[PDB]
Amino acid sequence: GSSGSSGEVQTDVSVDTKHQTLQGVAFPISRDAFQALEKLSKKQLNYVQLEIDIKNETIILANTENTELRDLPKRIPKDSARYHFFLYKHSHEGDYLESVVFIYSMPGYTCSIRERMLYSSCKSPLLEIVERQLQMDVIRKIEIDNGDELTADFLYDEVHSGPSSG
Template sequence: MGFPGCSLPGDAVVRNQPELETRWLLPGRAEVCGAGGGTVTEHLLCRGASPWSCGTGCSSLTVLAASLLVQVRLKMLYAATRATVKKEFGGGHIKDEMFGTVKEDVSLSGYQKHVSSCSAPAPLTAAEQELQQIRINEVKTEISVESKHQTLQGLAFPLQSDAQQAIQALKQKKINYIQLKLDLERETIDLVHTSPTEIADLPKRIPQDSARYHFFLYKHSHEGDYLESVVFIYSMPGYKCSIKERMLYSSCKSRLLDTVEQEFCLEIAKKIEIDDGAELTAEFLYEEVHPKQHAFKQAFAKPKGPVGKRGQKRLIKGPGENGEDS
């Protein structure tokens, strides 16, 4: 038998062929599935070599060979007893199964075709492939309370060379004011001017009909210390600008600030958004840069109950309330 300890039915035929790689099946049993009128149906078990070895040396291939001329009743009988043969032989030792009706099906090339067919992807239509990809993406999608996915990073219009030089000069404190604008046609960030500006001049720098980006070096004193803080001001004069201009200025703002802080290493103390230049006063800037700390508010204290009274009368008195010892 080749496999000790196996109890197989009497009508099952077991073929133990060690030289599986070269001869595949016994040449003497080729009429099992031959086209020359053979009417034999058999269960064939073939011992595998190193490619199938599982450590015990007992991995095998089971083949159900049935000629096309065999009676249907006999085919059904062998098909029904296939599970019993596998169970008695030991399902853990069986590597693969195949079914053949002609000689080519149980040859080495036939088994290779069987293996390639099993490993090939399922034949799917374009619609089925698209649905399968959608399901894969749904499984990989991370959705939870803590998950955050930013859909749009913002637009990144390039800074012109003169604008970059102005930012470097502001970092070195050679200038104290920069005004930038968007060129909507060329999609760039251009420099408007770097005129010396004091706090009283800031309202005059804010255009009334277009949006602008402003960088202002705010020189002031706080708690006895002299400070020079860079303040970013985004001015948008309400609905006087077109929708396209409002959207582009709003989308480019975050990327511009990231570029200034990361690439130019310019620390921005405060970011302010205004719609009217009249808001820019000395008091307003000071409160924005140094907001007031909220005074400590004492939590609500529960009022004490009346002194000398025991509260509402109870139907059931506790022990000792009548002057008796408990």
């Protein structure tokens, strides 16, 4: 009979403390995978399909084809978890610029928990790549549960990092 009664059980009212992270996986960078992000830095394309290999244990290339915004969410797979680097172009203060966005779609249907956790934890060692090689930094990280959420009304939101409720 622990439950039932409710009151001031949290006697914190003092300094708080938090961990540094939840996972800690670091996979190597493949050639094809890198070459895909390389062009992205030279403003050549606006779509990079990357993923992690469970057999090779590394971030390899999954695909590479031009993609737009109106069809951005139309390219996202509905039966495979991978990354999608979209070049969201906007005009701040009347100045048109280019920004590389990070998208991570995860369907999660049959793939074990070891694969879904390894595909979302492999982003860490994948982000430092362009941040330690191409010297390029992502405009903002975005993760969905389908891929349709990727819209000009959503992307612009994350990129802005503006305030929100929940």
